[PDB]
From a paper:
Very recently, tropinone biosynthesis has been investigated, and it has been shown that the key intermediate 4-(1-methyl-2-pyrrolidinyl)-3-oxobutanoic acid (2)18 results from an atypical type III polyketide synthase (PKS) AbPYKS catalyzed condensation between 1 and malonyl-CoA, whereas tropinone is formed by a P450 enzyme AbCYP82M3-mediated oxidation and cyclization of racemic 2. Herein, we report the characterization of three PYKSs, AaPYKS, DsPYKS, and AbPYKS, from three respective plants, Anisodus acutangulus, Datura stramonium, and Atropa belladonna as well as the condensation mechanism based on the crystal structures of AaPYKS. In this study, we clearly demonstrated that AaPYKS only takes one-round of malonyl-CoA condensation to form free acid 5, and then undergo the non-enzymatic Mannich-like condensation with the substrate N-methylpyrrolinium to afford 2. There is no reported type III PKS that takes one round of sole malonyl-CoA condensation in natural product biosynthesis, thereby, PYKS may represent an emerging class of plant type III PKSs.
The overall structure of the dimeric AaPYKS-COB is highly homologous to those of previously reported type III PKSs. The surface exposed characteristic CoA-binding tunnel reaches into the inner active center, where the conserved catalytic triad C166-H305-N338 resides as those in other type III PKSs. The crystal structure of AaPYKS-COB also graphically explains the limited round of elongation AaPYKS could catalyze. Notably, R134 and S340 make a salt-bridge and hydrogen bond interactions with the carboxy group of the thioester, respectively, which serves as a gate to prevent entry to the buried pocket near the active center, and consequently inhibits further chain elongation. Alanine, threonine, or serine substitution of R134 resulted in significant decrease of activity, highlighting the key role of R134 for AaPYKS-catalyzed one-round malonyl-CoA condensation.
Numbering used by the authors:
A (entry chain A): 11 to 391
B (entry chain B): 16 to 391
The structure:
C-alpha cells in the first residue's frame, strides 16, 4: 500500500496568506502600550520590551488595526466583555483569509477548483454555525456537495492533526482532492495589559495572524499534478497532566492563556519518544538525517528541542524563519514552514523539496501538551 | 477487511428531567416570568405542538437559582454555561461510552481512536482530552475533537468514522456525541417570541458507538454497516438556520421555511446515495431521521410517501428525550435495533437489509448515510 500509486496521501500544493496590516516587533511595545492607554505602566512596559526582545519575532500580521481598537475600547481592556466584537470580526475575516491562502494553493495545483471533493477548515479564532467551512465554500464558488469537516477550537498542534485527517480522507476515497485550510488570528486573545496578570504579556508578544492552505490527494495525475511531499504517517499523543501546563479557555473576555514555565522543557524531553515510535518502523534513528518542521511555539522551545535532540543548528532554520517573519500563527505555522522548507530548498539549489533529503518529520504541539508527529517524504524539486 | 461497522451503541442522559406537559409552568416560574400571561399561553401551545413528552437536563432549579443571569434573556452568561458544560459534557459522554464498551465486550485499551462531537461549550484541550482521562485510556489514543457542529453532526461523525476505520487496519473508533440545551437556555422575552421554539425543543443526552472494520469472529457482533455517507447543503440555507455563540450563550435563528425546504430537498439526497445500489423505493428501507422538530418528521413522511410506521423509532426518541442535536440519530439507531428485537424481527433494521440515516442542521446542511442491517 505504502508502495502503490493508488497509494499514499500527497501534498500537491501549498499556499499562504496574511492580513495586509503588520507591525514590527521592535516597535510593538510602544504601539501596544500607547493604543491600550497604558503608558503610565512604566515598569510593565519595560517588562514587555524584554519579553518581545526574547521572542526572536521580527514582525506579525494583524487583522486588528488601530482604527478597530479605537472603535472598540473593550478590546483594549484586560477583561471587559469582548467576545461579541471578536466574533463579529473573526466570523467574517477568518474565512476570507482562508480564501486568500486557498486561491494561492489552487493556483499552484493548477487543476480546476471544481474538482476539489473535500474541505477541512481549522481555526481556534472564533466559532459559528454554520462554520467558516460553509462560508469558504460560498467565497470560493465551490459546489454544495463538497464534503466538509469543520475543526474549531483546536489550537497550536492542529496543523499536524489536519495532515493526520487529510491522509485518511485522501487514501480512503478514490480520486478525492482535499482542500485543507488552517486560518488563525490573535484577535481572539488580544487584550490590554494588567500588572496583576503579567503572564498574559507572553501571549501578547507571541501570536500573529495568517492562513495556510494545502491540496492533498492520492494517485497524482501524471504530467498534471506535481507532488510536493508525501504524508508517510501521522500520530498523536499527549504528556499526562499537560492540561495543568498549557490551556486556553473561551470566555466572555475572549480567549485566555495558561502556560507554565515547565512547558518548553516538558515538550523537549518528550519529543524523542515520539520520533522513535514514528521512525523506528522505517529504520531511521539519526535525527540529523531528516529534514525538520517544528511548530515554533516560542523561541525557547525551538532552542530546547535543538539541544535535547542534538540537531545541527541549520535543521530548524525554516522554522526560525517563519517565527521571525510572522510570529506564532497557531495551527497554520507548520504549514507556512512546510512551504518555506521547499522554497529554501529551491533557493539553495537542492535536489528535493526537503533540503535534498528523503525523509522528514513535522512535529507540532499544543494545549494539554498534545504532540502530533507526522513523517514526511520529500519529492524531486 | 472491508466496510466500517457499528459494533456497539450506548446512550446516557442526565438524571434530572422535566415532563413537557408541566414545562410551561416550570419555565415561567423559575425565570420569574409568570406576569407574562399571554406569552406563557403561546409557550403552552408551542410545547403542545412539539410531540415531546420529556427532556433530560443538566440545568436544575438549584443551578438556575444560583445563577440568575441564566434566567434572563440576554445578560452575560457564557462564563457560567462554560463552567457547567466543560465539566459535565465529558462526564455524560463517559456514561454513554461505558455502555457502548460494555456491549462491545472488548477491553477498552484496544480503542485506538476517539471522536468527540458537541455544540455545548468549547475548551482547549477539549472534551476529548477530558474523556481520555475520565475513561482511563492511554495518551496514544488518536483524538479528533469536533466542536460547534450542530444538529447534522451525527451523520458527519459516521462519515468520518467510516474513513478512520477503513483506512487504519485494526482501528477501533469510539465516537461520542454529547449535547446539552444548557448552552442555549434563557428566559422568555416578548420581543423575541421565536426563541420560545428553542426553549421548547432541546434536551440533553449523549450517545456513543464503537466503529471498526474486520470484526473478530465470535468476539464482536456487528450491529450495522456504514455503506456510504455524503454531505450537501441547500444554497442560502444559512439565511434560514443559524446559531451564534455570543456573550449571552448560543442564539437560535430558524425560519418557518426550514421544514418545507428540508423536506423538498431530501429526495435528491436519497437518489444520489441509493441509485448506485439500485434502490428507488424508499419504503423498502428502514429509516433514521433527525427529529429537528415534529413538523419536519411529518413533512418528510408526506413528501416521500413513507408508510406511517417508518419514522416510529424517530418519533419515539423525540417523545422520550426531545431534540438532543447531534446525538439524536444515534439514540434512534439504538432504538431501531431495540424495537427490532422487541418485535421479533430478524435484522437490526426492522427485518430489512438497507436503511438510510438522514440528518440536517445549520446552513441547511444535510448528511445522508446508507446503512446495512445485521442479523438480530
Ligand atoms: O493559541 C493557540 O492556538 C493555542 C496554543 O497551543 C499555542 C501554541 O503555541
Ligand atoms: O442546536 C443545534 O445543535 C443546531 C441545530 O441545527 C438544531 C437542529 O435541529
Amino acid at each position: 500500500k505504502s508502495q502503490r500509486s493508488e497509494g499514499p496521501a500527497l501534498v500537491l500544493a501549498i499556499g499562504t496568506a496574511t492580513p495586509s496590516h503588520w507591525i514590527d516587533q521592535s516597535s510593538y511595545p510602544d504601539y501596544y502600550f500607547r493604543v491600550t492607554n497604558s503608558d503610565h505602566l512604566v515598569d510593565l512596559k519595560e517588562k514587555f520590551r524584554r519579553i518581545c526582545s526574547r521572542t526572536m519575532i521580527k514582525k506579525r500580521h494583524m487583522l486588528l488595526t488601530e482604527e478597530i481598537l479605537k472603535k472598540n475600547p473593550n478590546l483594549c481592556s484586560f477583561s471587559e466583555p469582548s467576545l461579541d466584537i471578536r466574533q463579529d470580526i473573526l466570523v467574517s475575516e477568518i474565512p476570507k483569509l482562508g480564501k486568500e491562502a486557498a486561491l494561492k494553493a489552487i493556483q499552484e495545483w493548477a487543476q480546476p477548483k471544481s474538482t476539489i471533493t473535500h474541505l477541512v477548515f481549522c481555526t481556534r479564532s472564533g466559532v459559528d454555525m454554520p462554520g467558516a467551512d460553509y462560508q469558504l465554500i460560498k467565497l470560493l464558488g465551490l459546489g454544495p456537495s463538497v464534503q466538509r469537516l469543520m475543526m474549531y477550537q483546536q489550537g497550536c498542534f492542529a496543523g499536524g492533526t489536519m495532515l493526520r485527517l487529510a491522509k485518511d480522507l485522501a487514501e480512503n476515497n478514490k480520486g478525492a482532492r482535499i482542500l485543507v485550510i488552517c486560518a488563525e488570528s490573535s484577535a481572539i486573545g488580544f487584550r490590554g495589559p494588567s500588572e496583576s496578570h503579567v503572564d498574559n504579556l507572553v501571549a501578547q508578544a507571541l501570536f500573529g495572524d495568517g492562513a495556510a492552505a494545502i491540496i492533498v490527494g492520492s494517485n497524482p495525475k501524471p504530467g498534471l499534478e506535481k507532488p510536493v511531499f508525501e504524508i508517510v504517517s501521522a500520530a498523536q499523543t499527549f504528556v499526562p497532566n499537560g492540561d495543568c501546563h498549557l490551556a486556553l479557555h473561551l470566555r466572555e473576555m475572549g480567549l485566555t492563556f495558561h502556560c507554565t514555565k515547565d512547558v518548553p522543557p516538558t515538550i523537549a524531553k518528550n519529543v524523542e519518544s515520539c520520533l522513535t515510535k514514528a521512525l523506528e518502523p522505517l529504520g531511521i534513528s539519526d535525527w540529523n538525517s531528516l529534514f525538520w518542521i517544528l511548530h515554533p511555539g516560542g523561541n525557547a522551545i525551538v532552542d530546547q528541542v535543538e539541544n535535547k535532540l542534538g540537531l545541527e543548528h541549520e535543521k530548524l532554520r525554516a522554522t526560525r524563519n517563519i517565527l521571525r517573519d510572522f510570529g506564532n500563527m497557531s495551527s497554520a505555522c507548520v504549514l507556512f514552514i512546510l512551504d518555506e522548507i521547499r522554497k529554501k530548498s529551491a533557493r539553495d539549489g537542492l535536489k528535493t523539496t526537503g533540503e535534498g533529503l528523503d525523509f522528514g518529520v513535522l512535529l507540532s504541539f499544543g494545549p494539554g501538551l498534545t504532540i502530533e508527529t507526522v513523517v514526511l517524504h520529500s519529492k524531486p524539486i
